[PDB]
Structure formats: structure tokens, C-alpha cells
Design a protein around this ligand. Structure first.
Ligand SMILES: O=C(O)[C@@H](Cc1ccccc1)N1C(=O)c2cc(Cl)c(Cl)cc2C1=O
Lengths: 425, 425
């Protein structure tokens, strides 16, 4: 409702930046208009001329001469228009966000293609956080989020979580420290936002439920904080039905959502996108305009043509192929865990994503059990310390990836792990 | 010599971020080592499988199965190793920087590939600037640089410039506001850095001279400030011998240089690179680690393989073709201007780049002459207002691009402008 509350002075001071009134007054005027006003380098000097890219379960992608010149040239900061248009329709299909037809100033849905979803998240954090601001999230969390938040000088307030994600009663108790009207009085610093990964949290593998999302949203309205929905595993849910998203229930216009193709189409191409209230997305776009300028035009065209040939049906058929693969990998690593972790450890079934989160019994810290004893036995799993704000505290947890390993490799790996737990007790 | 002086609290607080101890303890240990510690998604689900990219004056570039899988997956934040090593050798060949073998803490030359050179520049500004800080640069300046600096709250101090770039006497006079020893006393805020585009300034087309660079460098030592050498037109100089760069005379380790392939190889692939003192480059790398993560692996491999097949010889042959083209366009737009600007305007001959800077005589502000009268006559050139800190002040200057226009188009465009000037005198 009042987005200025969530925008630092620096972010608010931004104004629009280059490649401006050159390819828009010429993108509608007569074909006889000469423009020596543009800052674009002549693409005929560029040495790549054509491209052919083969696709599994899809038409081969071809960049002819003119399409290649476009791919090698600057493009809009928010993304190329045909990709933004497809993605917007996808978001309407998947989430029917309440904000689609709101006035801009009151949170009309808006999209920005980013150079990876993490770029969008970083610029969102920078847009909002003043030193000393309070922010809410569940630990353990993606180490990259914690390392992004650390230098911004916010107080991270841990919200309790279990196998169903954030626990609303913990969030409610935390918020009781304030009165709601304090959100209109910045003197005692009500939380600016809540961040969470609602599906297949890295490292736990846990997902939020529909009912807790609703509860959490009512509290976000009551104390007027934003929800940053970081959902890179959204297209990797193993349940029959995808849980409704925060975006899908965002009647106020207080959700900023991050999507990624990093886990399902390509991480190396650095393509993700933000969906959120237009006034906040605009502040991110202005920062992009003085930073990366835009995501790679070449990589956007690769993905846009892939998606447009697939149609929504072919895209969703791809995600079902990826769901099939990761859920079978999940079944395999759970079988190896049941097999070898013998009442030596505890774990919850991952609801989505690509990680299994193992609590080792009878040991207070495992990073000495792994980085010393396990490495020379030819096995490595990631100690859980790195996923907490205080990464020096002891952690009995290990994060095990099931994205790649064969059942044979899982059997050997959990064999070795079992031996190292027993001889350490 | 004291780099902490040039690093903000936030920037200094950054710690090294993900994709860490997984592909380095496995990149040297035995191949019998199993790792479930890694976080990488399975590239076999990614739908692009092979690529063939044709090159003009070059061997076609082929991404086979394994190369494509690498192209589609995460890679190091500073860039892929073979691109970094090639570029490092290029910088040694072009600039022979005095810092190559310095100890890290006193400015050992280091490089970062960035997602466009502007990303590296932006993160350099963010690394350095506290609100209230004083910075030096010459106006008119790239509008993207002015829009980047404005929200950081620094006081921009304009240094005088002429057809030979920054005037050293002007820089010396401005600095006489402080005593040299004031640089070791942050209380009265000596300038943190001087920023300049030394070759083919956008919008003026002017370039610095060797003698002036040496003078400027001496002042940067005397008053102990950094030089940010933003040099995107370095490979578009019309002379036979390139002017030595600030980097080439940087015996103190106080130069941060930005290079770009945007103007000669591809703007759309978003590839640039920073060269500078290792302590400062490292701060930028850590910001990339929580932001874009890395430049497109696919696009880095395209460029890297092209560069490795060309060798430095093939690369320099390419730049000389492009110089030749742009120098002929320059000759052409100067002819048009001689022909139809009849003592109606003044201009200097551009020394590099792709722009001509035209001062209309007898008119105080041209943006009404262009955005109103010229548009309906079918001709567009860019008013100079956008290239100054105060973009509301009147400007008699126009920027005209000679990157693309045919001689016929130039002849028409300047005929129209001439008529408008004459009937607008
Ligand atoms: O680069 C990234 O964004 C991802 C890649 C990824 C892909 C699929 C599933 C999960 C992550 N990534 C992590 O989140 C992560 C955490 C830690 Cl603790 C380490 Cl040590 C390394 C990484 C990492 O590469």
C-alpha cells in the first residue's frame, strides 16, 4: 500500500538510465526517419554470424544472420519482450495473481528477467535494507542468501521451522514484540520483510503447506511486511499437486517472487525472473540499468524460442520429465539411507528439490567427521554449519545431494558414512 | 598502498560465498573420491545438447556434448580459467602493468570477467563511495555513469576538459583545496578517485594525451586517490599507435581499469573485464558472488574459443578492421558536417569511438530544436543535456552517431539540421 516504506534513500534516488529515447521514437515513427541519436555499436562488425543449437524433445534452434545480429546487440533492461510476454502468461496460468489488473502504484504485477534469480534477490535486498533493519527468515537457509544479507547490516531474526516449513506460531510470537501500528512509525523498526524458500529448502528439503502460507500472509498484512518468495525449486515438486504460492494469494501486492530456470533448463545461461509489485520491480530495473544493463540477449533468445516452440504444454511436459528423474533419485537415496543409516541418523522425506538433510545421532558436530575422516575414505557430504547465520556453531547435520549419483554410488557412499559414525561414537 | 581507505564498511564485511569447497578438493584429489557435497543441478536434464556457431574470418566453433554441458552449468565468479589467462596475457602485452608481480596486499594485478564492463564499474563505485564522499570526473560524461553515481550520495566535482581530455592544470587547481597529507585524514574528505573515459569520450569524442596522463597520474599519487580508467573505446582509436594507458604507468597500484568487448565483439553477450589491485578486485568478486554469481558460461566459452583460435594476432587483425570501418564513417560524417554546417556549428574531430559532438551557434538550448522541430522533419540527434550532472541546464550541443548511417543518410540528416538551425536563428 505504501511502497516508500520498503525503499532505501539510495534506491529511491535512482532515475532512468541509458539506451533511452533512441529505439522507441524510432520504433513507432516513419521508416524514413534518420536517427544519429543512438549509442548502439554497428553489429555487422561482430564476428559470430550464425548459430545452430540442437534440442532434445524440441525443434532445433537456428539464429540466422539477422537473428544473430539481434542476439549480439543490446536489449531492454527488463528482458526481451517476447520472453516477458510468455513468462507473464505463465505466471497468470500457474498463480493467477490477484494483482494483474491493479493500478501500477498499488502493486500491479510486473516482471523483470534477471541474470539469474539470485541477481534479482540481491537487488531486492539492497533496495529494502538499511543498517539495523529487522528481517525474518528460517534457518537453515541457502548460504548465498546469508552471505548476501550479512554485509547489509540487518538483524536476521530466526523464525522456527519444522518439516512443514516456517511455523506460524513462532512467527506470531516474534511479531508480538511490536504493535501493528508500529509499522507506520519507523522508530522501533518493525520487520521489513520475511524471506523463505517455500519448496525444497536448501539444505533441508522441506516445503511449506498451503494452510501455513495463508496464516503467514495474514500476519504479513497485519504487521505490513513484505514476503520475498525465493522459489527456485518450484518446478521440482514431487507431490501430485503444487502447493499454491504466496504470489497466488497476494491481494495486497506485498509479495516479491523469484523464479529460476537454473535447476531445470540451465544454470550457466544465468536467467531467472522476478514477479512483483510494479513500484518495487521498477527500483530493481533501475539498478540493473546501471549494472549489467540487461541479461544476455543471446541466452534469452535461446530460451524464448525453446519455450515458444514447446508452448505451455511442452514446458510443463519438460518439468514432469525433470520431476520424474529427481523423484526417482530421491527414492534411491532414501533407500540407501534406510539401508545403511541404522538408527545412526534421522531424516525427513524431501518434498521437492535435490537435497537430503541427515541428522547424525550421538555427535555434536560432524564437520570434523567429514572434512577429516570421510575425505580420505573417498566420500564427501556437506556439513550443515554453512547454512546458519552463526556458521561457527556445531552442527550434527549433513546435506546429501541426490541430483547426480547413481544407486551404486549412493550405496557405497552411505556404507562409508555408516562406518564412520559407528567408529566415532 | 592503504586499500582499506577505499573500501566501505559493507564491502569490507563481505565473506567468500557459494560453489566453494566442492569442485576444488575434487579438482585435485583422486578420481575414486565420491562427493555428495556438491550443489550442482544435473546438466543432463538441460534441453540444449550441441551448438555450431559460424565465425567470419575464423574456424567455426562447435560445442559437442560435453562442452555444451559445461556451457550450461555454473562456473567461477571471476570467470572461466582459460578466458582469465588469455586476457591476463593480453593485458601484459598491451599495458605491461608495473604491478604484475607485486605482493597482493600492495596491488598485485588481478582480473575479473564481468557481465558487461558496466557491472564492474558499478560495483567499484559501490565498493568505494560513502555519502558525502568527493569524486572527480570530467563532464560531459556517459549518462550511465552519472545515473550510477547519483544515488550513492557523492559530490561530483567537475574537472575541466578540452579537445585533449582532462586539463591537468584544472585538476591541480581543484586539488589545491586540500593539502596532500589531508589524504591520511578522512575528516575533510579528499577525493576518493578520479573517473574518466580516456579514449573517445561519450559524447565528445575527445581523447587524453600521453603527457597529460602522466601529469594526472602524478597528482593521483600526490593526493593519494584512485584512478578509474573506463576505457570501452580503447580498441577504437583512429591513430596508428595507441596512447599508453593509466594502467601501463601504475607503479603504485592505484588504477582500476575497465575493458569491454561491447563495442568490437558483442554488446549483447554482456562480457567485460576489470584489471586492478587484487585487494580491490576481490571485493568486486565477492559482490558478484551474491549477485550474478558469474558471467554466462556459454557466452564466455564462445568468446574464449574465438580468442584462442584467433590468437592475439587474429584479435588485433579484427580490431584493425573495425577501426578502419569506424574511421571511414568518421571521415564521412565530418564531410556531411563540413558541407551543411556552414559556420552554423562547431565541432572537433573525434579521436576514437563512434560519436561526433556538435555545438550549434547562436542557440542556447537545442533540445527544443530537435525533440520538436527535427523529429517531424524525420531526423533525430541526441541533445547533450543528458551528459551533465545537471541535465536541466540548457545545452547547445548535439551528439551524432556515425556507427551505422550511410553517407546518403548523413547528407540528408545534416541538410535538415542546417535548415532548422538557419530558420531557428
Ligand atoms: O550456485 C548455486 O546457486 C547453487 C547451485 C545449486 C543447484 C541445484 C541445487 C542447489 C544448488 N549452489 C548452492 O545453493 C550451494 C550451496 C552451498 Cl553450501 C554450496 Cl558449498 C554450493 C552451492 C551451489 O553451487
Amino acid at each position: 500500500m505504501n511502497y516508500a516504506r520498503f525503499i532505501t534513500a539510495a534506491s529511491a534516488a535512482r532515475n532512468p538510465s541509458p539506451i533511452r529515447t533512441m529505439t522507441d521514437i524510432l520504433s513507432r515513427g516513419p521508416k524514413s526517419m534518420i536517427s544519429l541519436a543512438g549509442g548502439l555499436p554497428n553489429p555487422n562488425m561482430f564476428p559470430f554470424k550464425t548459430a545452430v543449437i540442437t534440442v532434445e524433445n524440441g525443434k532445433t534452434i537456428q539464429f540466422g544472420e539477422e537473428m544473430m545480429k539481434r542476439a549480439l546487440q543490446y536489449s531492454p533492461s527488463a528482458g526481451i519482450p517476447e520472453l516477458l510476454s510468455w513468462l507473464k502468461q505463465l505466471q497468470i496460468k500457474l498463480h493467477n495473481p490477484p494483482t494483474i489488473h491493479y493500478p501500477p502504484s498499488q502493486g500491479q504485477m510486473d516482471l523483470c528477467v534477471t541474470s539469474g534469480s539470485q541477481q534479482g534477490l540481491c537487488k531486492v535486498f539492497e533496495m529494502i535494507i538499511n543498517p539495523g533493519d529487522n528481517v525474518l527468515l528460517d534457518e537453515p537457509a541457502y548460504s548465498g542468501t546469508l552471505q548476501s544479507l550479512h554485509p547489509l547490516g540487518c538483524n536476521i531474526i530466526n523464525v522456527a521451522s519444522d518439516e512443514s516449513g516456517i511455523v506460524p506460531d513462532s512467527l506470531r510470537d516474534i511479531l508480538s514484540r511490536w504493535k501493528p501500528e508500529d509499522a507506520k512509525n519507523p522508530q522501533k523498526n518493525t520487520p521489513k520483510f520475511l524471506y523463505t524458500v517455500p519448496n525444497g529448502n536448501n539444505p533441508t528439503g522441506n516445503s511449506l503447506t498451503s494452510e501455513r502460507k495463508k496464516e503467514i500472509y495474514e500476519l504479513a498484512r497485519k504487521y505490513d511486511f513484505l514476503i520475498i518468495e525465493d522459489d527456485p525449486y518450484y518446478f521440482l515438486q514431487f507431490n501430485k499437486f503444487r502447493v499454491p504460492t504466496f504470489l497466488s494469494m497476494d491481494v495486497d501486492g506485498r509479495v516479491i517472487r523469484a523464479d529460476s530456470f537454473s535447476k531445470i533448463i540451465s544454470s550457466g545461461l544465468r536467467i531467472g525472473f522476478l514477479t512483483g509489485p510494479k513500484p518495487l520491480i521498477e527500483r530493481v530495473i533501475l539498478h540493473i540499468q546501471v549494472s549489467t544493463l540487461h541479461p544476455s540477449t543471446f541466452n534469452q533468445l535461446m530460451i524464448s524460442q525453446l519455450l515458444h516452440e514447446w508452448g505451455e504444454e511442452g514446458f510443463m511436459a519438460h518439468v514432469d520429465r525433470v520431476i520424474d528423474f529427481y523423484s526417482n533419485q530421491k527414492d534411491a537415496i532414501l533407500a540407501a539411507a534406510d539401508k545403511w543409516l541404522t538408527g545412526l541418523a534421522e531424516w525427513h522425506v524431501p518434498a521437492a528439490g535435490m537435497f537430503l538433510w541427515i541428522k547424525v545421532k550421538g555427535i555434536n558436530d560432524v564437520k570434523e567427521l567429514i572434512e577429516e575422516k570421510a575425505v580420505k575414505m573417498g566420500v564427501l557430504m556437506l556439513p550443515g554449519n554453512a547454512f546458519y547465520v552463526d556458521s561457527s556453531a556445531p552442527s550434527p547435520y549433513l546435506r546429501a545431494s541426490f541430483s547426480s549419483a547413481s544407486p551404486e554410488q549412493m550405496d557405497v557412499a552411505f556404507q562409508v558414512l555408516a562406518q564412520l559414525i559407528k567408529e566415532s561414537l
